[PDB]
């Protein structure tokens, strides 16, 4: 089985640096051409760069070429990519592929000034009712959230954050109940935010 | 550089049917198109390159076609792991160019939303910022619009919002907008109202609240 491993994604302030990696295996790694391409979130595919066996052929997209360093270790099954200067436009997932016929998962760029930062969880109250929480002020991505510890789980939606112009991220979750449960049965939403090891647990009423 | 056109951005489906979808070239690009399959969990698989060849460990039900400018991905019947999102790209000239994506969703009747207005709380409040949260519950199709007025005045700019993936049992659709004010210019104002449109409303559905009642 053809494998590609990507890592050496994380958190980056505006003007800094990276290096991401990809390691192969399952295939000779010195006979293929490689690629890069990035993906921002709720955007398309955008190709990188591509660089042959031996590395003396190495092409970029021409927006990326003075930003970017595409390179390989054939030693080390390994292809890289350099990242300088990165900005927020460059937040994406980057996903490595042999040609364009096996793509590694991915890694994750974030670029960003903000500071890890637990949510804020706030009621919103009901008065079929709908109620919810609203998790605010966090970063970085993800939150989870559950309902009763897990034993609501119909009727539920949990919202996609919104990137806030703080650099903060918002979300909402949701659920629809009967009216006449509203007197007597609790709710409780859990929302842990695993990146500042914070956990809320918020009782919502009328 | 050479701009790929896929010009549905959504394509309704149902389970069985044979779907096609459409990308052109702004020149020609010899049959140098590959298409590919984003699942909803993102990851990405080569599907057809060079136009026609099926890549290895793809399905035989996906086919492709076309020439000079104009190319098509064909799904002869469409199963469950297929509802996915669909870019073509070429590789004729540097640099390679993709098409914007063709998400694919399965077809439903209109079902209009419920919609619930969700004042700020007093905890909020507190720290200096009002949010105000507009609910639309369960409806088909995606199109929806959200329109925040604060005592007639429309509001533009500052409220964001967000949608559900499609639903596994129901094909529906949910979607949640906040409007962010400061707590001072919240306590300005009396009435805090959203107003929806949709397919499934005759008429757009206000829903509001005056503050502090």
């Known amino acids: 089985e053809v494998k590609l491993l990507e890592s050496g994604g994380g958190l980056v302030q505006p003007g800094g640096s990276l290096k991401i990696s990809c390691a192969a295996s399952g295939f000779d790694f010195s006979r293929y051409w490689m690629n890069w391409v990035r993906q921002a979130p709720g955007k398309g595919l955008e190709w990188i760069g591509e660089?042959?066996?031996?590395?003396?052929?190495?092409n970029y997209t021409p927006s990326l070429k003075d930003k970017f360093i595409i390179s390989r270790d054939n030693a080390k099954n390994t292809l890289y990519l350099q990242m300088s200067k990165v900005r927020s436009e460059d937040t994406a997932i980057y996903y490595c592929?042999?040609?364009?016929?096996?793509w590694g998962q991915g890694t994750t760029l974030t670029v960003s000034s903000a500071s890890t930062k637990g949510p804020s969880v706030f009621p919103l109250a009901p008065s079929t009712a709908a109620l919810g929480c609203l998790v605010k002020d966090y970063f970085p991505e993800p939150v989870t959230v559950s309902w009763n510890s897990g034993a609501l789980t119909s009727g539920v939606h949990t919202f996609p954050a919104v990137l806030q112009s703080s650099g903060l991220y918002s979300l909402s979750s949701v659920v629809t109940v009967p009216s006449s449960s509203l007197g007597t049965q609790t709710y409780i939403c859990n929302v842990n935010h695993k990146p500042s090891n914070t956990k809320v647990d918020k009782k919502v009423e009328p | 550089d050479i701009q790929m056109t896929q010009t549905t951005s959504s394509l309704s489906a149902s389970l069985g049917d044979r779907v096609t979808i459409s990308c052109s070239a702004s020149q020609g690009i010899s049959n140098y198109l590959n298409w590919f399959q984003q699942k909803p969990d993102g990851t990405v698989k080569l599907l057809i390159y060079?136009?026609?060849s099926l890549h290895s460990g793809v399905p035989s039900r996906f086919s492709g076609s076309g020439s000079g400018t104009d190319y098509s991905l064909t799904i002869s019947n469409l199963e469950p792991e297929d509802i996915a999102t669909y870019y073509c790209?070429?590789?004729?000239?540097?640099?390679?160019?993709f098409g914007g994506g063709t998400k694919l969703e399965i077809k439903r009747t209109v079902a209009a939303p419920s919609v619930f207005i969700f004042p700020p709380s007093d905890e909020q409040l507190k720290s200096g910022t009002a949010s105000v949260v507009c609910l639309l519950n369960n409806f088909y199709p995606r199109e929806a619009k959200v329109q925040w007025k604060v005592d007639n005045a429309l509001q533009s700019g500052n409220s964001q919002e967000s949608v559900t993936e499609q639903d596994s049992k129901d094909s529906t659709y949910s979607l949640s907008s906040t409007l962010t004010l400061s707590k001072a210019d919240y306590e300005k104002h009396k009435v805090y109202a959203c107003e929806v449109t949709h397919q499934g409303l005759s008429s757009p559905v206000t829903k509001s609240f005056n503050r502090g009642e």
């Open positions: 060079y136009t026609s």
């Open positions: 790209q070429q590789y004729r000239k540097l640099p390679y160019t």
């Open positions: 660089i042959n066996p031996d590395s003396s052929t190495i």
């Open positions: 592929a042999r040609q364009m016929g096996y």
